Amino acid sequence: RMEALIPVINKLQDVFNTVGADIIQLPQIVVVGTQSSGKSSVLESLVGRDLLPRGTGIVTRRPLILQLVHVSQEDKRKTTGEGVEAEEWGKFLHTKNKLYTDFDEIRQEIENETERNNKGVSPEPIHLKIFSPNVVNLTLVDLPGMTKVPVGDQPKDIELQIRELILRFISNPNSIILAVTAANTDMATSEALKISREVDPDGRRTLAVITKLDLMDAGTDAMDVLMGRVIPVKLGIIGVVNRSQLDINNKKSVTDSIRDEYAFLQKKYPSLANRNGTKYLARTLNRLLMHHIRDCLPELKTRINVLAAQYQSLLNSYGESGSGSKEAADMLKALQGASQIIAEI
């Protein structure tokens, strides 16, 4: 079937990046949320294990394009450091074709690049492909979390740069914003939903994810929110119950968590349990991204053809080293690779 489009857009995310993927306006999902929104837990429940750096320190302030590539369970490698085959592995773009079978080394490597003009915030994303038979085909551009208070309600000046970086990605007209908000907070005044209404006043291209449903105060529930009566978003409202830090320190598996999540949703939200949960979240994002890329593909393949022409006339106006011409030349070479990938189905 011809909805195998996610790997093609993955290749486009790699062929640009350095030359600038912003002007291409690639169809992708931008993950926005605060730092106590369980944002890292929503991603690790899709991966199926620990991955993201779980110690704060002074790091984890950099975009992370997470590319989950589904494989069959008969597709295995040799463990890094030469038998015993590895069911899952990973590849960083900056390390080229180096293999990563130990997920502790993968998690270490994510933190090794987030720390390396950047005054604490760097716009350059980290490209990481996770090959696994337990994930669906899905790509998520993960952005640094905001503070749960507005910018003026906290001292650190660097927070303005964080919202600048977020607006840089969600200003993409072809980006789908996945806003993550906790249930034990005032979801009508969420920092994730608030900043999404800036580039998308209606809920046209925004899907809301409500986390930590079991951490709400006694006597209330998210029934009014999970039924589409509170948050004005139009791509859907999905509630999940991810792993807590206590579960991770107790080495609870994602498999055990999604099972206990289904039980929590059947007891508390029986009439809504089939449209919520981590399993439903991954299935919806896969279909949502596939349908979105297909709709934006004819626009994208014209966008590449128009941009290369205008960059060519930009080189001639430059005349006959030169940093402006070197920038245009590299961009023209990236568009040549982009046109080849689109041409190959």
Add this chain to the structure above:
Amino acid sequence: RMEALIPVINKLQDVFNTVGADIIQLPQIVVVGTQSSGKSSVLESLVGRDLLPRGTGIVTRRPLILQLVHVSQEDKRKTTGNGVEAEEWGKFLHTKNKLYTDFDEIRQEIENETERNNKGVSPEPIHLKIFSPNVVNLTLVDLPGMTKVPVGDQPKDIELQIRELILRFISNPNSIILAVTAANTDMATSEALKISREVDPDGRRTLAVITKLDLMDAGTDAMDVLMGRVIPVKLGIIGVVNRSQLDINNKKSVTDSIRDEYAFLQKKYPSLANRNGTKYLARTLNRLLMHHIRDCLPELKTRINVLAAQYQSLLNSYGESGSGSKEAADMLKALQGASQIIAEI
């Protein structure tokens, strides 16, 4: 979707094999046809390139379990023995985890194992997994081709052994018979269809494939056959136009071949072109095998548990080396692996 059943049965096809998979009655598609039925071309049009041994000699007289495993185009290997990422590769069960990037070396291995008590025909199948982004998830156990004339109409007595090998596989109640017949032959007296009516009088579990549609005599066509007015099979009759030996020697690609096949079907069979062709063949067989495995799965995992019980009582009757007890022990060990693989979805 939880149609991850083709890799599961692929693992079962490997976990048995040595101990005997006949009594397990695995859900699989058995390809039957004559020497000149274009059966080998129907297999290479699904693989997408040359694969099967193309020199006769006196060999290729063994079953071939061909397991096409789809991969994403970002899933590549190192070439056996230049950088050069490998989009496709292969692994033989007898060579364990050895990699095969040169497809000429893969063809060589098929003939190295098909030649190695057997008096010209060996029931031991050759297990070969082909990982490729240009194939669909599909498994086809290919059996040695018969003679175009009946057994009594040719001198070699080994043909009786050939018919026995086919009847051994298609007598499986859970096997789907893929009958391959040429269009320039009398399909009412086809050697492939007639042996299929022995184990399957109606076309309950038989799909007919008509090849070489462009090789029919002037003034005739397969319109009466592709409309279900001739061959009494019930899973469907699909006609294809595969590469000839002239096209293979001229290094024609399968992409160009299916290009000419679609054009031929628009000219000669305009009202039926939509339900025929190689693309339709792979798409139909992929759904056909997936649905068949899902229908046979609840009974299959009951069979494994019952067989293990009956093999246990068989050991007890044996009492207190011994080839009969060793056979029962191996079957209990293989069924132990089968039960674990089935338990994991």
